[PDB]
Write an enzyme that holds these catalytic residues in place. Sequence first.
Site, PDB file in Angstrom:
ATOM      1  CG  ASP A  67     -20.592 -13.657 -76.081  1.00  0.00           C
ATOM      2  OD1 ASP A  67     -21.203 -13.766 -77.294  1.00  0.00           O
ATOM      3  OD2 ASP A  67     -19.766 -13.219 -75.842  1.00  0.00           O
ATOM      4  CG  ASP A 110     -18.222  -1.929 -72.160  1.00  0.00           C
ATOM      5  OD1 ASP A 110     -17.838  -1.330 -73.327  1.00  0.00           O
ATOM      6  OD2 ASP A 110     -17.488  -3.341 -71.852  1.00  0.00           O
ATOM      7  CB  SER A 168      -8.734 -13.717 -70.409  1.00  0.00           C
ATOM      8  OG  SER A 168      -7.729 -13.722 -71.505  1.00  0.00           O
ATOM      9  N   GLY A 169      -9.638 -11.127 -70.980  1.00  0.00           N
ATOM     10  CA  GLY A 169      -9.608  -9.498 -71.687  1.00  0.00           C
ATOM     11  C   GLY A 169      -9.531  -8.439 -70.827  1.00  0.00           C
ATOM     12  N   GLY A 170      -9.977  -7.308 -71.390  1.00  0.00           N
ATOM     13  CA  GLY A 170      -9.903  -6.176 -70.206  1.00  0.00           C
ATOM     14  C   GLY A 170     -10.438  -6.249 -68.984  1.00  0.00           C
ATOM     15  CG  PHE A 171     -13.295  -9.559 -69.102  1.00  0.00           C
ATOM     16  CD1 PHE A 171     -13.160 -10.803 -68.648  1.00  0.00           C
ATOM     17  CD2 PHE A 171     -13.453  -9.166 -70.631  1.00  0.00           C
ATOM     18  CE1 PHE A 171     -13.235 -12.005 -69.544  1.00  0.00           C
ATOM     19  CE2 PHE A 171     -13.160 -10.369 -71.379  1.00  0.00           C
ATOM     20  CZ  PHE A 171     -12.920 -11.630 -70.776  1.00  0.00           C
ATOM     21  N   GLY A 172     -10.166  -9.129 -67.230  1.00  0.00           N
ATOM     22  CA  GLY A 172      -9.431 -10.165 -66.520  1.00  0.00           C
ATOM     23  C   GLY A 172      -9.629 -11.464 -66.965  1.00  0.00           C
ATOM     24  CB  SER A 173      -8.507 -14.726 -66.496  1.00  0.00           C
ATOM     25  OG  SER A 173      -7.473 -14.198 -67.108  1.00  0.00           O
ATOM     26  CB  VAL A 174     -14.421 -15.327 -66.929  1.00  0.00           C
ATOM     27  CG1 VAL A 174     -15.437 -15.964 -66.251  1.00  0.00           C
ATOM     28  CG2 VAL A 174     -14.321 -13.813 -66.835  1.00  0.00           C
TER      29      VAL A 174
END
EC number: 2.7.11.1
Length: 273
Positions: free
Chosen positions: A96, A135, A14-20
């Site tokens: 990644d 990004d 999770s992060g600035g992108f939300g939760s995956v």
Amino acid sequence: PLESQYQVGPLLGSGGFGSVYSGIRVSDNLPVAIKHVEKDRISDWGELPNGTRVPMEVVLLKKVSSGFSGVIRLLDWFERPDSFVLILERPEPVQDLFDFITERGALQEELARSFFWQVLEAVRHCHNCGVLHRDIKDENILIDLNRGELKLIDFGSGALLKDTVYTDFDGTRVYSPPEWIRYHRYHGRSAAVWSLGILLYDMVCGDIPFEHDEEIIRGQVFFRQRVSSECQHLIRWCLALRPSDRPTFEEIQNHPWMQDVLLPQETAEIHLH
Ligand SMILES: Fc1cccc(F)c1-c1ccc2[nH]nc(-c3cncc(O[C@H]4CNCCC45CC5)n3)c2c1
């Protein structure tokens, strides 16, 4: 709707992108990734051809989603009262690029070339479809470890591509160009090329070249690992202080360091299997 069609697995992060989350599509056991974003955290909204109010990320992914596999495919999406949920493809096994570089350290030039070339093909595809990622970095690139194919992910800081100046930015600072640091102004293509120079340096040196604002503004590149002169030259070109001195994508891909790239499958057989 979402409940029945997908079986939810562990949290990937999770992060600035939300939760995956990892996940599986119930109908055919297709591996997926399930991404949740709260509406409050979304500053950048867009509109579909339907005239429907969605996160820009959904607009951008639909514009780039086609047979080309250099970008993560959006399989489906859903609105909820306080969130949006995106169903994205998930290669298996995957890692990644940030984790991959962390484990290996600096990448051999042959491997960096293959990887960088695929990133370039993916970014060109986005630009052709009217999409600016904003990004580009190791964390936002996935490696399909069996096929040796790279995919761009996380379009949540992206925008529609335009030829006029951008005065908003929400990507990663240490990948952002000096014109943003100094003037809070940049243009799409030349900013993207700067982030690609940062990425290439990261691949071949095992870390990013600049930490602080003043280093970015100064733009002096120091090589901490042995890197060929041709690769050094391409990097320094991408990181030219003046935006207009940076190469076009075409110039990058015609650069001598970029010739005789390995195919993805060859790349996997030599460097990943
Ligand atoms: F399934 C995975 C396992 C390990 C690492 C991964 F990145 C994934 C994976 C697979 C498919 C995916 N589709 N979309 C994503 C995605 C989308 N937005 C953000 C994001 O961030 C991940 C990558 N960088 C670190 C943070 C992260 C949560 C783990 N991934 C995706 C990820």
